[PDB]
Amino acid sequence: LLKKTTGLVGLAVCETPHERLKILYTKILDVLGHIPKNAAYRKYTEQITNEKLSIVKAEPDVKKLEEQLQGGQIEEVILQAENELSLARKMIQWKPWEPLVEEPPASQWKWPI
């Protein structure tokens, strides 16, 4: 359709969103490959990004992809995919699947006091 404006300021119109989304999802998969499999974050994020890769691969149209991905405009999907890739890099660096660092005191979350 070659949408003139995406409706949001600072968000330029992506002329080729299909290859961009596919390369972002594959990059997310390669980044998530290094996470150990027993972490639930790897399983959950791999599942949702594989579902998103399947739905973005099985349809050529852009308007139906926007209306059935439930992510708003396809540029918003690209932005949230980039943010999820940044999250995957940060969780690679941070390793949050380890056990609890410190137990709280017994009277810490007791309300009312």
């Binding site: 404006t5 949001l8 300021v9 600072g10 968000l11 006091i113």
Partner: protein
């Protein structure tokens, strides 16, 4: 003439409202919310009464829900007149400032007739409203609201198509969609930048689900989009007021749980239980169960939320007031980067900044 750093200093009106709430009961803390935003006086109590009723696990009667929306929407006409006209006063066009003040004086009589005060009504209370509308009040609302559509077109004529107003407005105060969300912005800030977000449509409260209206959103995120969104919100307020006047249901104005809302004066002088409950409610106050909640409404400035914490007694443990203008002033350094020193009187203008709720 140009700007790279603009650091505002606040605290000139710091009264410490949210500490004084801790030493007063829930009913005694109700007039405090009137004086936080003194141009949205009747909208802040709707946020506080929704917080107490959520903790108390009660709901207002159906007649009380329509009154709060009707007088909430008349306060949007209160606030947005202060928004545009003082923004025009700061820029320099003083002519429509006095035109709308006669209209704002006319809706001050509506506040005085139902509650008794022009500004600080203390009308909306947890459990309903304090008093009913006087007889023939809604007849006077309709005859005023019929003629109010000309005044918005009167105000729009001298400002929208004016080339002098446009040249001060069309390219100063531009945000993007992503940085507006990260800056805690709400209200016209998100709507002006093109983000579709309105609390009355997504997370509705008392009877806003039933009514039908439109949410005007911007195209470029400049000050001119934020001026047009404020003028169009006057039109949608008239649309709600016309709907509310024809769909006011019968019933009581207060919740019939007399342990929360006080009983009537005729029944407190005849029944024993009504006199006991009148004694404890006006001296001790009702016991709010422990639990922390964050209830946010759509104020005309933005998202107004109250974080209320109850310790089990009749007094709040902690009552944080979230100001829509507090986060809006936090972005002022980024707002005026690269603009001229005379543009800050318009960048302050396009955000509904009132120094009562900013400094608490």
């Amino acid at each position: 003439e140009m700007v790279r750093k603009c650091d505002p200093h606040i605290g000139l009106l710091h009264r410490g409202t949210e500490k004084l709430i801790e030493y007063k009961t829930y009913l005694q803390a109700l007039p405090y919310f009137d004086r936080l935003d003194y141009v949205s006086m009747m909208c802040n109590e709707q946020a506080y009464s929704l917080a107490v009723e959520k903790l108390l696990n009660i709901q207002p009667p159906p007649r009380a829900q329509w009154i709060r929306v009707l007088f909430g929407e008349i306060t949007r006409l209160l606030n947005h007149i202060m928004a545009v006209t003082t923004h025009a006063l700061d820029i320099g066009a003083m002519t429509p400032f006095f035109w709308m003040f006669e209209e704002r004086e006319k809706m001050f009589e509506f506040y005085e007739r139902v509650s008794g005060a022009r500004m600080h009504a203390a009308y909306v209370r947890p459990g309903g409203v304090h008093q009913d509308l006087p007889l023939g009040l809604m007849d006077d609302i309709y005859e005023f609201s019929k003629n109010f559509s000309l005044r918005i077109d009167e105000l729009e004529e001298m400002l929208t198509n004016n080339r002098i107003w446009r040249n001060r407005t069309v390219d100063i105060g531009v945000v993007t969609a992503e940085d507006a969300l990260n800056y805690g912005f709400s209200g016209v800030m998100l709507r002006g930048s093109g983000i579709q977000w309105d609390l009355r449509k997504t997370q509705p409260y008392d009877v806003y689900d039933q009514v039908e209206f439109d949410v005007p959103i911007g195209s470029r995120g400049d000050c001119y989009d934020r001026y047009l969104c404020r003028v169009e919100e006057m039109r949608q307020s008239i649309r709600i007021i016309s709907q509310c006047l024809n769909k006011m249901p019968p019933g009581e104005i207060k919740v019939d749980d007399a342990k929360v809302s006080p009983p009537k004066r005729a029944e407190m002088k005849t029944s024993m239980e009504s006199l006991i409950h009148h004694f404890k409610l006006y001296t001790e106050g009702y016991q709010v169960p422990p639990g922390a909640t964050y209830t946010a409404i759509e104020a005309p400035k933005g998202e107004f939320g109250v974080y209320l914490v109850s310790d089990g007694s009749s007094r709040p443990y902690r009552c944080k007031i979230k100001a829509p203008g507090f986060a809006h002033l936090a972005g002022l350094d980024k707002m005026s980067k690269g603009h001229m020193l005379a543009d800050v009187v318009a960048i302050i203008g396009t955000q509904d900044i009132v120094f009562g709720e900013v400094d608490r």
